[model samples]
Target: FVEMVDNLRGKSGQGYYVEMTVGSPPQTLNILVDTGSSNFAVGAAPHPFLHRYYQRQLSSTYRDLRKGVYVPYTQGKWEGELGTDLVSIPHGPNVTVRANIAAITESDKFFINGSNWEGILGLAYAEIARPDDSLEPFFDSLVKQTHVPNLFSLQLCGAASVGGSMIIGGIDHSLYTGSLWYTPIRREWYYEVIIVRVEINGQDLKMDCKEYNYDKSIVDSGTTNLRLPKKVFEAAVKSIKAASSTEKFPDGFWLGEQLVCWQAGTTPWNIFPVISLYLMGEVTNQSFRITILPQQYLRPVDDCYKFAISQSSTGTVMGAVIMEGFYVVFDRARKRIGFAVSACHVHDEFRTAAVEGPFVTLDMEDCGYN
Candidate 1:
């Protein structure tokens, strides 16, 4: 399994990275693991911080199948030429996979000059892959070519003392316990799932999901925090305003339409309410509720505690923050996603902070926080 763990170098929680070795001599690079996009590209020259691009000349196996492509992100774009190479994950025993590597010539914004990432490896379907040369995704190729499983799970911890893991090939029981809850993949372009409804402090703040393409939400491991529609986010802010002292809602430090961040040591987030998202299950024809506690959502950013950020996007998205304290499995073959309490989650902390409230109850703590 690739070490997809935190690299808390800056605020808003730096994205997780995967260690990969490319070429014949096996040049290693810390590639940013993205679930939102589908494009495997590396820096053309030596990176400012880490190792650089995989030299095509160094690898005897490198095949220059150059067809120029441009991959875009919300933050930046990557322009590069595509080629094939032998890629390996040097995790104890080496695991190799045939990769369609993009030796990026130019990167804009968050690509090369913006972020510290040496490369970008996508964990997504080929539906959104590069138009000209859409080779199979890394995991898809690995499972097809190697002994790897069709499953990949993510556990991204938030607090500094906490660590996370991304289990490939198979599930490790020691990392998580209890039945793995399954939700059908509504769309394959990104790991989008159907969200039944949303609640704040047990109060249902329903949305006009019809405009949201059946309320489809993506489970993005690349993002550092959660994003909500303006409608629901407004309601959540109002609920938090009414639930606690009115002083925390004062405006100024907000990151977006709904992020009501307060100066550090100014707010007691423990008393804030929990946000819940009820997801529809394909097996039971019922909905399973996942809770996001204040400690998990109210992030301490620099000199302030940031709240949920609103988005101009129409649909809901379950980002790294909401996924925290939960072991999430992306079963591509099954066309479904699984969720349970992550072993990395603070069980005692969640249990201690969680009270028997009318909003909801987390009774599965004995089995493992569910």
Candidate 2:
């Protein structure tokens, strides 16, 4: 249990946000399992956006860790619920899990105009862990109460249409393949590795890349955003410029409104290119991915171009936003990393699935016009 404190918590951070249908109870809500922080929440959240939902089974099926009080978060400005019972990980045995219903509150702050989040599922054990007692973690509570082994894994699918599963308790043999990259945790029973460097095609595009390991980074399933130093981000843009041009692809240069992506055909050129974050040998996650934040997202112009990668800062910490839908196997016991290619259908044999997620298509891309 030695994962870096900062590494475990990302900005614009990504916690576990399960994709479940929240209607009336009797029909269980299909949610995702999270571990980055132990707070079962939800987003892409349902409306009212100020109160938590409840059902007959939900009323007392699980424990209320929040003690019915709304715990606030820095990101999402989203809402959530608090209920508990048995939540079976996709591959692991079914356990009596104490989960939440992702209820929203008045304090939640969002940049969106009128966002309707179903809720966000947080799995950070720190959030729910008692200050003085060492009780079982949220999921651990589930495992122990149900007589199942203590374990779970997240096979985050790229899109909802693709259909992915977050297995708890046991490993599904057919779920993975090839080799497993195990990492040891410096803290929290999580496999938090060091980020020695981030290179894109030999070029270190740190997005605020650095000579020192990014001691503050976490392997999250609920987040899909990444906040890099403006300099590192610029480097990534520069690489995008180079990679596209090198490949003879259209070049979309410029930042801010003045920044424009060269108009290209339906080919992949118009979309963001493949950028890699090269970490010290064996520290990077699977599937080389690089997110292209909308120019609008890099606001103020001051921090724009100004790198913003540091420990202890309160900003968009990388989470599912950056590491979305990837089969991330955090071998906390060994300090290794095992990731799978993120798409939809996965090819597994033994070891573990490479980095990957569900939808081979469908992204927030469709929801935005800016």
Candidate 3:
């Protein structure tokens, strides 16, 4: 089903939400679009301003698994009970996937204050999933058990709009320009892509990943900022720091934490270095580059500028910020991923692009995270 993503940006918190109905009676609820982790559960603490839990007693199709589920995030965590139910995507003629794994939260410390959605709908594989990793993911169930195709796609609709759309089990050709660029999954779990190089302006960060014999990077929809390795992140902060002569510490600045920021209206972001990712191919030995504009990275916050965070230590997380203006496709049938400039940008032909990976290097230096 093609579902419109209600992406709300407010003083409370910013996120993209989709309308989802659950249970036999088909109770409607707002669900967050998350691709990083896999665990479909809902229930928030009783608060006047927040949405309430999805009572399993109301649904006749609900079957309790009696297994407790716990999911922890960078900021908060969720704990709940696992179960199965008849879940559908949208509209009257919905593709119903019965005996689906659904979790109902008992206690939530993560989404207490700022969760507009009822619960998160995990879109990743069950291998790296939470609660019961054995449980089939919602999307996997849709493709395997139902008539839906073995694929799903995302259209973020850029940063200006309040809504986007998600097509489950199918592809929306109108959402993208040119053919979809397909990239092989370096690993099966978290949509990991092979990134050969990451650079700012013309200078390369030189990831130099040789320990594992191949470079793998994760593309996650749940996270808001680009997570980087400590050494690379530090180098980024230092490089940008040297290029511009803005204040070292703005009012809301935290040393080593909030490294990149400028005064209210010092230097225009147009002069900032453009970040580029060189996605490599293993078999073909080809390379595809996706450029992140300054607007996508140098986002304006409260009193100062807020750049992407580099606290992942040893991992690379390409989150919503980077994927916002692109049309992303997850193809389990071919075991690869597809990407292109979003149709939100302009009109173009639908010629798909695919990148196959673990693009090897002969002069690969081991840039260990120190």
TM-score of each: 0.83, 0.58, 0.81
Separately for all candidates shown, the number of backbone clashes (residues 3 or more apart, or on different chains) is 0, 101, 9
TM-score of 2: 0.58
Encode model 1's per-residue lDDT on 1-370: one tens digit a residue.
Answer: 3343332222246566666788887888767767887778887665454446667888888888857778776778768788878888654224776788888777667543444458877888888888542577777778778777688777766563334667776665666655567777877888887655567777876654332233446888777667765665666667766776535554643453344544655555556777776665654435576766777666664245666455536456677777776878888878898887766654424332221112322221121111
- Model 2, span 175-211: residue lDDT tens: 4444334333434633344343455544555333232
lDDT of 3 by residue, 19-67 (tens): 6677889877777778887777666345443576677888898888887
How many clashing pairs in candidate 3? 9
Per-prediction CA RMSD (Å): 6.0, 11.6, 5.2
Q: Which stretches of candidate 1 lie over 4 Å from their true place?
A: 1-12, 47-51, 112-116, 160-162, 208-215, 254-267, 346-370
Weakest 10 consecutive residues of candidate 1 by summed lDDT: 361-370
Provide the lDDT at 15 for model 2: 31
Span of ten consecutive residues with least summed lDDT in model 3: 346-355
Q: What lDDT is obtained when candidate 1 is compared to the true structure?
A: 0.65
Candidate 1 clashing pairs, residues 3+ apart or interchain: none
